[PDB]
Amino acid sequence: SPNVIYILMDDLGYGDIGCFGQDKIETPHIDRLCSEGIKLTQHYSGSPVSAPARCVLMTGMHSGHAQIRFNNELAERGAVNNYDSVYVHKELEGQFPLQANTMTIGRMMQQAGYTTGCFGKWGLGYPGSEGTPNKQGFDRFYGYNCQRQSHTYYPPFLYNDEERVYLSNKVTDPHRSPLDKGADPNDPASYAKYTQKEYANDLIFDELMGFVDANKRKPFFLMWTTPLPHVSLQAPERWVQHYVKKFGDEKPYTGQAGYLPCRYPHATYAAMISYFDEQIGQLIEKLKAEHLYENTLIVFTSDNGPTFNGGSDSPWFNSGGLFNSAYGWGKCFLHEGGIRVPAIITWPGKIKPGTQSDHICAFQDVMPTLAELAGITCPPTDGISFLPTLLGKKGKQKEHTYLYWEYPDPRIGNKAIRMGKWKGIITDIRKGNTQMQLYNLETDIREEHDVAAQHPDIVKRFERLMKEARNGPDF
Numbered sequence: 157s158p159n160v161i162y163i164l165m166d167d168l169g170y171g172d173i174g175c176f177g178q179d180k181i182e183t184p185h186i187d188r189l190c191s192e193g194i195k196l197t198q199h200y201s202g203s204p205v206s207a208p209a210r211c212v213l214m215t216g217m218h219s220g221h222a223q224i225r226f227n228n229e230l231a232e233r234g235a236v237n238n239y240d241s242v243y244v245h246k247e248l249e250g251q252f253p254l255q256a257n258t259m260t261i262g263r264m265m266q267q268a269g270y271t272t273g274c275f276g277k278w279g280l281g282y283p284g285s286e287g288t289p290n291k292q293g294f295d296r297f298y299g300y301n302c303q304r305q306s307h308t309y310y311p312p313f314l315y316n317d318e319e320r321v322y323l324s325n326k327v328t329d330p331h332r333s334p335l336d337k338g339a340d341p342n343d344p345a346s347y348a349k350y351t352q353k354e355y356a357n358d359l360i361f362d363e364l365m366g367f368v369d370a371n372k373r374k375p376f377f378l379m380w381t382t383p384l385p386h387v388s389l390q391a392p393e394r395w396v397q398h399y400v401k402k403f404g405d406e407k408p409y410t411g412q413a414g415y416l417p418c419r420y421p422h423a424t425y426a427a428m429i430s431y432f433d434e435q436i437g438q439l440i441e442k443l444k445a446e447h448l449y450e451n452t453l454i455v456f457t458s459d460n461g462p463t464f465n466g467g468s469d470s471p472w473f474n475s476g477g478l479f480n481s482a483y484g485w486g487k488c489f490l491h492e493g494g495i496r497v498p499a500i501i502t503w504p505g506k507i508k509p510g511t512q513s514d515h516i517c518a519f520q521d522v523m524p525t526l527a528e529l530a531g532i533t534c535p536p537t538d539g540i541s542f543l544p545t546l547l548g549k550k551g552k553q554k555e556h557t558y559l560y561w562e563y564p565d566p567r568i569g570n571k572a573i574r575m576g577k578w579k580g581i582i583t584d585i586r587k588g589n590t591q592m593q594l595y596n597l598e599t600d601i602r603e604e605h606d607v608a609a610q611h612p613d614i615v616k617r618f619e620r621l622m623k624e625a626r627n628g629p630d631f
């Protein structure tokens with residue numbers, strides 16, 4: 157049973173990496189990883205936003221059964237949105253917690269004899285809660301507890317396990333840091349103040365690499381939950397200038413769609429992904445140098461589709477790849493662009509290199525996949541192992557009858573079914589819509605031609621399957 161490294165990026169689109177059709181952003185180390193293993197083309201998140209996606213991944217329950225189904229900031233605690241206040245009061249930090257003793261893939265691997273580590277972002281329980289990573293199957297955590305904290309890459313503190321470590325960075329509000337009055341938005345010097353001393357991603361990486369170095373002679377399960385490339389747009393000047401040379405001059409971002417101003421939004425978004433790409437390259441080098449490469453399975457994927465704010469330009473990068481990526485088509489929505497994420501798995505000598513599988517699978521499936529892989533009986537799950545697909549034993553690959561998603565956000569409210577080529581969506585539920593849109597993904601991959609009235613049989617079946625699939629209060 158091998159080492160497992162699960163690399164989860166944050167708001168990385170289906171088409172944001174070279175091996176899924178990206179033409180502008182250079183991802184050589186990720187493309188190399190794809191060439192050395194299997195490419196999954198119909199792999200789905202638990203959810204089109206961060207916390208619930210991660211909840212489905214950690215717990216092997218789909219969004220219709222999961223504890224966390226939306227980003228819940230527990231605003232009743234007080235000034236949770238005030239960055240001065242969160243710095244003073246950790247009680248105000250972070251998100252709705254996982255319940256005590258929740259079986260997670262961390263906990264499951266721990267009981268199998270793995271040393272478990274999570275490096276990057278949590279988002280699944282506030283500090284002091286029973287939902288903290290160390291109380292949810294991780295021997296080791298470093299990085300952001302809080303999805304709001306990661307809105308800046310120069311935060312005043314991070315977490316080493318249960319403890320804050322204070323950095324040399326000053327406290328900032330990345331939503332209330334506009335340019336100085338009368339500062340030229342075309343002058344790069346106007347953006348100098350957004351760069352401080354300690355880039356969180358440098359520190360997260362050094363801690364991940366130290367964990368690998370420390371457990372290099374033991375079975376380890378390591379989750380690299382990088383906040384990249386989630387806004388704000390901040391990257392080392394090295395990588396920004398590389399893409400300023402390639403793309404040329406561009407319109408600056410002044411903060412109109414939230415998060416920090418950025419002189420070069422295109423160059424910086426590309427810089428963020430290629431910088432992380434370079435870190436994966438350094439990790440592969442270390443695994444090879446320590447003779448771990450053959451005995452380590454690596455997953456690379458994203459928690460949801462690409463975003464529409466913070467100076468992102470998903471359409472310009474075609475971050476959806478096959479899918480539309482404008483507001484309504486990506487992040488926050490149950491369109492394919494929102495819930496379908498690029499996936500690579502390598503395990504040198506076991507997974508045939510440069511192969512592809514269109515097998516319909518999702519984040520719930522990771523729990524049973526890892527259970528089969530590590531040779532321990534699978535806990536209760538909505539998932540189905542896709543290990544047979546990874547090892548090219550397609551004969552013994554069980555199939556989901558259908559997949560269900562719900563995103564009960566306060567404003568819009570979404571449900572979706574996929575059953576074969578058929579994709580049903582109900583959106584605007586909070587406005588009292590119950591009318592389903594129906595797309596044939598074989599003939600309409602971009603979901604541009606609603607044909608619900610031409611298949612009332614399929615709509616009725618999907619309405620029934622939506623009732624059967626879900627737990628808890630309806631919306």
Ligand SMILES: CC(=O)N[C@@H]1[C@@H](O)[C@@H](O)[C@@H](CO)O[C@@H]1O
Pocket residue numbers: 206227229251303304463465
């Ligand atoms: C669309 C957008 O900006 N989404 C983010 C989301 O990704 C997460 O960071 C959240 C805090 O939990 O804050 C925002 O809602």
Ligand SMILES: [Ca+2]
Pocket residue numbers: 166167205206459460
């Ligand atoms: Ca995300």
